[PDB]
């Protein structure tokens, strides 16, 4: 298992009159497409976003999707009519359609629909299906949608043949951007702890790509098991930020270092020592009144 292709649809229905549908498309952690509600054409976000599809091939898809968006918006507007007291506005729908690409010819396809935040329906095989725990009233809308044999065929075509084919080409086309290596840049900081005479040590790691990194607090070869990794936050330039903390007692800072391991470094692990020549000099440049 390596790259997951995701086409994300976000449709908001405020009432009978107001609606809007916006999409984003993700090949791993990189967005390839963007489709605003105001844009009548799918916009490329990378130079290799068309993949290995011809202009006529791509145009046939874009037109397919163009037609679909207006059809989907009305079909929901109609299902609210039909589902009268069981459900009503404001309505929120999410769609996740794509491929998980594995070595060789191996691929698994998916189409998942979330209603009002919860995942309730999936397209499975040749039909729409509710998933465990879905509201009972979804049975009629499914029975109604599964009546359409054209959509089923169109969808089966995409998930089974088009999506894997597309994304296989997408992978060759974007190889230079997908296989990139960006070196992280680390810097230390510190703040008081909840407890008296206790400090929290922050080790900031930023600008690395791909996502897998190792950030630990050390005291020689001794990995400080107290280290609490933060959650990967993105940067605007399609890179990553992460910070590792350690709770110490005042004076236990001397000897501690922050060790960063990453693919871009090439075995040359960043060792950042608390109180190092650089730490002192970097700290002077980042002073404020709190």
């Amino acid at each position: 298992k390596n790259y997951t292709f995701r086409c994300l649809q976000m449709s908001s229905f405020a009432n009978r009159s107001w609606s809007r549908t916006d999409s984003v498309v993700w090949l791993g952690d990189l967005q390839t497409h963007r489709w605003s509600n105001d844009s009548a054409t799918i916009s490329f976000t990378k130079p290799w976003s068309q993949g290995k599809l011809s202009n006529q091939q791509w145009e046939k898809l874009q037109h397919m999707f163009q037609v679909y968006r207006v059809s989907f918006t009305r079909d929901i507007q109609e299902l609210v009519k039909m589902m009268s007291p069981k459900e009503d506005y404001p309505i929120e729908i999410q769609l996740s359609a794509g491929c998980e690409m594995y070595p060789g010819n191996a691929s698994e396809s998916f189409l998942h629909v979330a209603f009002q935040g919860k995942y309730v329906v999936r397209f499975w095989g040749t039909s729409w299906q509710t998933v465990p725990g879905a509201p009972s009233w979804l049975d009629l809308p499914i029975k109604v949608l599964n009546a359409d044999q054209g959509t089923s065929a169109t969808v089966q075509m995409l998930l089974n043949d088009t999506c894997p084919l597309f994304v296989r080409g997408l992978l060759e086309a974007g190889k230079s951007d997908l296989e990139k290596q960006e070196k992280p840049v680390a810097w230390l900081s510190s703040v008081p702890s909840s407890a008296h005479g206790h400090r929290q040590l922050v080790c900031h790691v930023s600008g690395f790509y791909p996502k897998p990194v190792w950030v630990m607090w050390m005291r020689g070869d001794q990995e400080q098991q107290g280290t609490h990794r933060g959650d990967f936050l993105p940067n605007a330039d399609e890179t990553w930020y992460l910070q590792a903390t350690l709770d110490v007692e005042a004076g236990e800072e001397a000897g501690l270092a922050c060790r960063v391991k990453h693919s871009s470094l090439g075995g040359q692990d960043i060792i950042l020592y608390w109180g190092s020549l650089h730490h002192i000099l970097d700290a002077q440049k980042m002073v404020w009144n709190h």
Partner: T-cell receptor, first 114, second 113 residues
């Protein structure tokens, strides 16, 4: 399966008179429609319904209202009759699980008099 | 108007063939169907066309559909006098019951004995 029947066959109304026309189907169709046929024009939808208590506006929804009392019956009401107009109203019923199963009524003929 | 039938009126000698047609701009174009409306009565289905290139035939009525050319022809073989009526062409824009029908103005057919 059965029949979709409109009532009355013919209708006489005076300028401003509020006329109503009933339609009963035994097909066991959830969807019901009220259309208006004008000479040199296609059928235009006035109102439609997914079952009891549901009345959804068509395109020619102005000057009319519908009332779906039960699955079997749909009822159109002309809010006020026009000066000396002549009109045809057509009732249709449809399967909620088969878009292609549509059955039509034999039409109601309206004549407004002075 | 999105559905247009041709010609407005058609005259055919009894025992001959009748060819009435309809072109459309409705999108999506799930299915096309023809009705016969007898003078002062309701609408009666003759045929339903569903495929990209479909041909269907009910009794003496036959029909075709080129969903690419967005065109459909109605064929009345051996025109009887009982065929004197308006022929209405309808397009359904969806496969589920969430769709809406689009109706042509009709072609009035007159069969000279």
């Amino acid at each position: 399966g059965g029949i979709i029947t409109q009532t009355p066959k013919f209708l006489i109304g005076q300028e401003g008179q509020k006329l109503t026309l009933k339609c009963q189907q035994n097909f066991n169709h959830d969807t019901m429609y009220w259309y208006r046929q004008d000479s040199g024009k296609g059928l235009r939808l006035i109102y439609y319904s997914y079952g009891a208590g549901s009345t959804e506006k068509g395109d020619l929804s102005e000057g009319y209202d519908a009332s779906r009392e039960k699955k079997s019956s749909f009822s159109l009401t002309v809010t006020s009759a026009q000066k000396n107009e002549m009109a045809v109203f057509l009732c249709a019923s449809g399967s909620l699980l088969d878009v292609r199963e549509v059955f039509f009524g034999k039409g109601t003929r309206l004549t407004v008099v002075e | 108007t999105q559905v247009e039938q041709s010609p407005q009126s058609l005259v055919v000698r009894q025992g001959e063939n009748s060819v009435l047609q309809c072109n459309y701009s409705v999108t999506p174009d799930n299915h096309l169907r023809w009705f016969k409306q007898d003078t002062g009565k309701g609408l009666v289905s003759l045929t339903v066309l569903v495929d990209q290139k479909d041909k269907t035939s009910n009794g003496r009525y036959s029909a075709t559909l080129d969903k690419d050319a967005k065109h459909s022809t109605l064929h009345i073989t051996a025109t009887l006098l009982d065929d004197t009526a308006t022929y209405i062409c309808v397009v359904g824009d969806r496969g589920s019951a969430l769709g809406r029908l689009h109706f042509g103005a009709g072609t009035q057919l007159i069969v000279i004995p």
